[PDB]
Write an enzyme that holds these catalytic residues in place. Structure first.
Site, short mmCIF file in Angstrom:
data_model
loop_
_atom_site.label_atom_id
_atom_site.label_comp_id
_atom_site.label_asym_id
_atom_site.label_seq_id
_atom_site.Cartn_x
_atom_site.Cartn_y
_atom_site.Cartn_z
N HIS A 1 -11.00 3.93 -0.57
CA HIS A 1 -10.18 2.74 -0.47
C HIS A 1 -10.96 1.51 -0.87
O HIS A 1 -10.37 0.50 -1.24
CB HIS A 1 -9.61 2.56 0.94
CG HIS A 1 -10.52 1.81 1.87
ND1 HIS A 1 -11.71 2.33 2.33
CD2 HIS A 1 -10.43 0.56 2.40
CE1 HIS A 1 -12.30 1.44 3.12
NE2 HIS A 1 -11.55 0.36 3.17
N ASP B 1 -8.12 -4.77 5.23
CA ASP B 1 -7.78 -3.49 5.83
C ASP B 1 -6.63 -3.50 6.83
O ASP B 1 -6.06 -2.45 7.12
CB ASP B 1 -9.01 -2.94 6.56
CG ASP B 1 -10.03 -2.32 5.63
OD1 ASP B 1 -11.21 -2.67 5.75
OD2 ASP B 1 -9.74 -1.46 4.77
N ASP C 1 -13.97 6.96 4.50
CA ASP C 1 -13.13 6.40 3.48
C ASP C 1 -13.82 5.45 2.52
O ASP C 1 -13.75 4.23 2.68
CB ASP C 1 -11.92 5.70 4.10
CG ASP C 1 -10.82 5.46 3.10
OD1 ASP C 1 -9.68 5.19 3.55
OD2 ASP C 1 -11.01 5.55 1.85
N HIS D 1 -10.33 -3.46 -1.06
CA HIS D 1 -11.24 -4.60 -1.01
C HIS D 1 -11.53 -5.22 -2.37
O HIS D 1 -12.51 -5.96 -2.51
CB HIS D 1 -12.55 -4.19 -0.33
CG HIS D 1 -12.40 -3.80 1.11
ND1 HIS D 1 -12.07 -4.71 2.09
CD2 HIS D 1 -12.54 -2.61 1.74
CE1 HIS D 1 -11.99 -4.09 3.26
NE2 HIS D 1 -12.30 -2.82 3.07
FE FE Z 1 -11.99 -1.35 4.36
#
Ligand code: FE
Ligand code: FES
Ligand code: FES
Ligand code: FES
Ligand code: FE
Ligand code: FE
Lengths: 193, 447, 193, 447, 193, 447
Positions: free
Chosen positions: F208, F362, F205, F213
């Protein structure tokens, strides 16, 4: 002290409140406040609700505990009631609650409940205008145990206004608590914060 | 457990197995057969009046976004990103033209459509069928005088048909008063009870009032204070009970317009409802006009309850068999003066909110009754709701539904559980209808 | 201050205790009490049990923690033992417990436990008769973490009697705690409240 | 899982599958086959001596009211209202001629009968068959020298027969001493262990004493302090182990009358038990008189344990496979002087109570052993209880039961688990008897 | 006061720390410390992170929170890193964290979080050598509520060093916390203890 | 649920049923088919370098002792006493020649053998077959350049074969750099997410990163700060994605040697990795030497993840379907100067540790996505991982594995879930191989 345009997470209200304590630290006032809050917690803890009302609560009191709806930090269009009142009691409304607590048919009070309060972070400052209006801030952890294995712990910051009542006794004339937890996980909030 | 055969509710709704309040497998089965099948309260127009306004709400254990469309309609969607399933919206209310997922940035419209995907052209090229990636939408969203309900089941009856005989009772206050608004935001508290415990209590439990709430009645000085500790009995025909085919039902306490509100609001309310009642006599008739200013404790099957006049509005959100998240709003009449509205709202929360001293009276009742449902020796025991059985009528010339012409009885429990059994043993709406072809006859069997 | 016939939830004992703190507020005494309790909590927190005994505990101490049976608020016929003693230790009994804590074969002490105490609501008043008997009241939250994911938090009000011992050091001569939770949900109550 | 076929306990009770301490389905199955079937400790006469006196107690996960009837008998009932299942009594003890439900006010007698229903005539008329609405009653309630047990299963053996060979060992202290009383109220603590962990530990685990309790032995200066950290071994024939057909069993440590009590009580106790022993020699014989003042660690199947002389009395109340609620009382001899009684009670709690430093030693043992039972790679592993196997005898001329003529061994574990397997694989008491026709032969197989 | 050879559970470090508070009790210093910590908790509670940095944190600060590996009480051979740093921030590193908190795209900050701190057991003592180095010890309970039903409570003892900065304002120059719970059960430790 | 037939993962790994992140029965099934079958990270040589050194580690929900033998090998054993199943070791690390059970004193060697039993001769005589009572041993324990993995399944492929195509990518940093060490002890935090949520996020991933972030990138000034809030797109061919037959996979971001580390470490790292890269060009080739100093976000199937260069090393320890215990270590190159090593470790924890501001970003993503998997209306919904499907290649001349020649894509998700489906529907390793005979063809199907 605080610039809310810079300190972006700070509410105007919060910035206002912190300003009154930062300027004048009256050491003896903080000690009075401490005593006042300790005795009040003591009376509440032993469930002396009438004594509480008689000795700690002013006839013009507003006892308010709100629960703010969760909204976007960047929300600026939605303008419906932001909070509801878990409590918004005048002296007589507190008295109704007090009588409900003492009523011999309040089945939920048997067996007897156990309260333990922990008051910390006491700050005290006289109001700028009303020289008889004492601002007291304090945090409470309130522990309530009942029926063997039920344990509820409440956490809150209290923004109080205390004023000398009849007989010179400083009494609570305003308590405001914005309850931190949106969804209560304590069965109810039937305690006096 | 075999829900096709298991008699969870006895004939005529006379009794229920205590396990229904504690059984987790059954709870799971309710998610499908109760919550995914029936109408569930979402919000009120007054909460999302302007385009882009939205709230989140629970439907069963699911979370949904309920959003006011540009065309003035309301659509509801699963609060779940269509990509990798992150919860889309983290607040309870606001205004926006769409929702962006904080995981990978997918942008959904207030209409649920997948509107943007970061770097779409560069990553997906033309592969992404956005048209097929809209938020999972709640099939049915209907309004009852501004009260918005949703249903995941497209085969469900229209909401009005679903309300059945109960609708006649609510209309004076919901329709003929000029309309209600919901004062938000709601209080929210978790109790350790099954959703059905407070649901059944609000649907038809006037019997517990005098005893359960003895301390509150006495303390508040409310218009029902004479019943404290079962000191007095509600007069002959002080009210009635009704229930309906799809489960909704309510108790009626004549004239109790100020309801649970302490003495401090009694005069004003009693004055307000009386003045309105007087205008309504001419429009809808004396009976219905009186119903308007009469206290209705009602449950709209399955998990939405209310006390008209008192103005308490509840959602019993299911979490598990012994956990429920209680939402408490205040209902007020739109034409009441603002200050009264404000004070009614405070009073509603004061009595039935998170620190409602009345609602507190009920805690232990709801919690232990639910928790006892898990206890080995109680699982197969029978909760009784036989009070007034063999005296309910159906098709009355004045009061529609299966009706108990008595303020205190278990008529409404019978109807609630009859509908509950039917759904739980049914695989879809047609089966429910088949299982409910003789519903009122079942409810009046010895009458 | 309190009329127990009016304040119906208040125990005679509780009403008694609150009276000693309401009359004379000796500001310097409260501060002594605070120091005494803070140092005692500090020693307990770092597990200096011998130091605790040596510096905080009087040779005539009674260290008592009770657990009251749940009975009807309106119960007046049933008169069997109302409470049991979770603790009811004399100095030597504390010492047995202290040695048990320090024993290299106390397997439950490895790895080392982590204690954190929070003392609040300190009140102090000299006894009316014994001018050398200091009454101290305080509330404790006691947090104990062990073995990675075990966390137990205890809550209690402490009714203490402290008296100048040898070398003029005020030491605990009586600690009484009526533990609020009837059924413990903390694995045990093996901590010094 | 198929409990008819599943070998949870190997032949002769030599081993058990570790899952028995963690398996929730099995826990549920135990509710039926262990707890609903067998004798469970409720209270003691000394706790409810006068008419109307009652305590609540757990039976399995069920709660019951145990009440002294007017005729001097004791009846027990589910603490659950017969109407809508609210928990009837919220306190742990008191005195009353009945119990009123706080939900709708139903009044039950101390005899469990439905005595009053508010507004009965007006609401129910004559419909209510009160006779049929008494609290669900515990079928069997019997006494062993003042110790009151209950059993939901009417087919169960009388309690004395149930105690089997174990009864002979307890009688000197329970009967011949002039009687015991239970000092309440009990301590109550929840531990994260399966009920069987402390049950098996008290039934036959003397092996762990020296090591587990090294620190306590050393610290307390008690009469067993020589075993601290396995420094010394109990002399030749320092005691024995026994077990019985229905699962009860105990360890016997000769002469250890002051037991776990610290040096501060040793002289007095040793003096008291010695004086009594001397009178008993004449009445019941030297052996039995010695047993009286000998330390018995015993479990009365399934979840009641005790240490005579030390005077610790335990109930391991089951909550789930890894949760147990421990009740700790003190047992004292009725003729001991009051002050000793008081001090013995404190000492019992001091050592084995909520803050018992001895009981604390055991926590991690019981908790991790139970919790490991849920761990994937341990579920199918075998807990060993083979110590002393092939040396136990049955039908001894002096000591009855299956008996290990050694202070330290796992004889009692074998008997406990043998009875546990039999019940778990049995649908009723007859099947258990059929499954237990060769019990002692199974336990002595290689002897 | 403490002999670690006798008080076998006591760390050399702990014995060191308690010694500085036992000797000289400067009543006015304890009160300064109290004020300093109360105001700092207040700013943190209302999320005035920039104000916090500006008014409470020294430019040479070391803000450290460690997590000690569980090892045998009797372990003396295994000598690899005993702890890791949950925090080990210099002023600029705190500032990175502060900016991360104020960033409008910190999605986890919407809706707004609610913090409530309870500071207790304050002790204060000037360093023996550096007459400008104030040692402050205090315990914190930190309650964080977010997103309706998330509640995390942290518990810790803080060993601080505070020193007069520019404008005579005493600022934090060192905070050391050995976090009591080895495995966090709070989702994360993203709060300023 | 029938895992032989249930399509939990669609063909080519294009989608997964959302329930896989919430289903407890499936979680239980994973214990057998995922965790008991595959290679699991235990520790690193640097953590137990000397004989007798040991750490505890989780394998699935099981706990094991990992101990350095006298011969320099490492053996691992269930942390469970062979007698009555108490947890043997209560600390996380130390040095010892054996472990003694605190319940009854049994002494096990660091080699797992039952070495002593208190009072053995006197109690057991010669009956005790100690040889047969060693700690349950983890069948397979292998090393990948000092990184120690264990597998309960003897039929498993050697670890190198298990790593498959992923090994080629890790070797430059794991082997050619001169070796890595793990800086302990790890941070440990429990999150309310399924283990697969962070596992899939680390495996493939990169999408993302910019959005999730945004705040951290912006705040830290790290070398990826240009992607904050999806402001910029990684250049053409800024990296790639790969996956392999047994599930492992990783993203490659070219040259990002300083990785997530804030500006304060960028210069030094970029200088260090550049200098090393220069020496490696000569030894392993330009490409591989560049991979060494390129940021790899990798998951070693099933629950071990890492960010090379950033030096984050994770174990996602499973507790239940919505609970995971996150272990966070720092990986550093052995030849880095001590001070850098120390500071890299702090920085790793600073960004991804218990209070890692990045890892915090996250949380909500992983937690709600997992929790939504239990929500009734989402259980049967499809998590999409179709990004870049039909553009992955297999058997490339330069980059081995199924490879997406794009920095951002879901290639690695596809491979991860393909292997997950195969195992979950397989009863053993042979079935998995049979189910995986066309793995890469399945992954490239439209290419
Ligand atoms: Fe992350
Ligand atoms: S989970 Fe929402 S964009 Fe990926
Ligand atoms: S539940 Fe007890 S009277 Fe109704
Ligand atoms: S459980 Fe380990 S020696 Fe008995
Ligand atoms: Fe009610
Ligand atoms: Fe023991």
């Amino acid at each position: 002290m605080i610039n809310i345009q810079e300190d972006k997470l700070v509410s105007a209200h919060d910035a206002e409140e912190i300003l009154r304590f930062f300027n004048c630290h009256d050491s003896a006032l903080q000690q009075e406040a401490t005593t006042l809050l300790t005795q009040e917690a003591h009376l509440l803890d032993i469930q002396a609700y009438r004594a509480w009302l008689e000795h700690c609560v002013g006839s013009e009191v507003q006892y308010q505990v709100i629960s703010r709806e969760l909204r976007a930090a960047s929300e600026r269009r939605y303008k419906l009631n932001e909070a509801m009142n878990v409590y918004n009691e005048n002296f007589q409304q507190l008295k109704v609650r007090v009588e409900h607590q003492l009523d011999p048919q309040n089945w939920g009070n048997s067996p007897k409940l156990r309260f333990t309060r922990f008051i910390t972070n006491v700050q005290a400052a006289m109001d700028v205008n009303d020289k008889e209006l004492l601002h007291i801030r304090s945090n409470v952890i309130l522990h309530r145990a009942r029926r063997g294995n039920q344990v509820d712990v409440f956490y809150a910051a209290r923004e109080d206004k205390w004023k000398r009542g009849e007989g010179g006794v400083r009494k609570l004339v305003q308590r405001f608590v914005d309850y931190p937890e949106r969804i209560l996980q304590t069965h109810n909030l039937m305690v006096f914060l | 457990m075999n829900y096709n055969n298991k008699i969870l509710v006895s004939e005529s709704g006379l009794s229920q197995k205590h396990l229904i309040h504690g059984d987790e497998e059954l709870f799971q089965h309710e998610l499908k057969t109760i919550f995914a099948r029936n109408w569930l309260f979402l919000t009120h127009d007054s909460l999302i009046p302007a385009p882009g306004d939205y709230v989140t709400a629970k439907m069963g254990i699911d979370e949904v976004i309920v959003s006011r469309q540009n065309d003035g309609s309301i659509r509801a969607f699963l609060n779940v990103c269509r990509h990798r399933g992150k919860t889309l919206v983290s607040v309870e209310a606001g205004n926006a033209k769409g929702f962006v997922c904080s995981y990978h940035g997918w942008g959904f419209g207030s209409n649920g459509e997948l509107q943007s995907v970061p770097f779409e052209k560069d990553l997906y090229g033309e592969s992404l069928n956005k048209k097929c990636l809209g938020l999972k939408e709640v099939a049915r969203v209907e309004s009852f005088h501004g009260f918005i309900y949703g249903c995941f089941d497209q085969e469900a009856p229209p909401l009005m048909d679903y309300l059945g005989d109960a609708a006649w009772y609510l209309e004076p206050m919901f329709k003929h008063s000029g309309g209600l608004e919901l004062v938000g935001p709601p209080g929210k508290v978790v109790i350790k009870a099954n959703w059905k415990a407070p649901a059944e209590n609000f649907v038809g439990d006037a019997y517990h009032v005098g005893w359960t709430h003895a301390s509150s009645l006495r303390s508040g000085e409310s218009i029902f204070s004479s019943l404290a500790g079962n000191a007095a009995l509600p007069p002959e025909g002080a009210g009635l009970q009704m229930t309906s085919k799809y489960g909704s039902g309510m108790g009626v306490l004549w004239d109790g317009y100020s309801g649970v509100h302490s003495a401090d609001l009694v005069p004003e309310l009693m004055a307000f409802g009386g003045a309105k009642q007087e205008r309504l006599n001419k429009e809808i008739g004396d009976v219905r006009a009186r119903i308007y200013r009469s206290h209705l404790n009602c449950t709209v099957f399955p998990n939405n309850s209310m006390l008209t006049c008192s103005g308490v509005f509840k959602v019993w959100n299911p979490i598990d068999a012994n956990t429920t998240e209680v939402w408490t709003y205040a209902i007020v009449e739109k034409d009441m003066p603002e200050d009264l509205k404000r004070r009614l709202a405070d009073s509603v929360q004061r009595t039935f909110g998170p620190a409602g001293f009345w609602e507190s009276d009920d805690n232990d009742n709801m919690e232990t009754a639910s928790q006892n449902g898990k206890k080995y020796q109680s699982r197969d025991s029978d909760l009784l709701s036989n009070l007034g059985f063999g005296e309910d009528v159906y098709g009355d010339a004045v009061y529609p539904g299966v009706v108990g012409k008595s303020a205190i009885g278990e008529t409404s429990y019978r109807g609630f559980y009859r509908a509950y059994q039917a759904h739980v043993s049914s695989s879809n709406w047609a089966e429910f209808e088949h299982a409910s072809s003789t519903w009122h006859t079942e409810l009046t069997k010895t009458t």
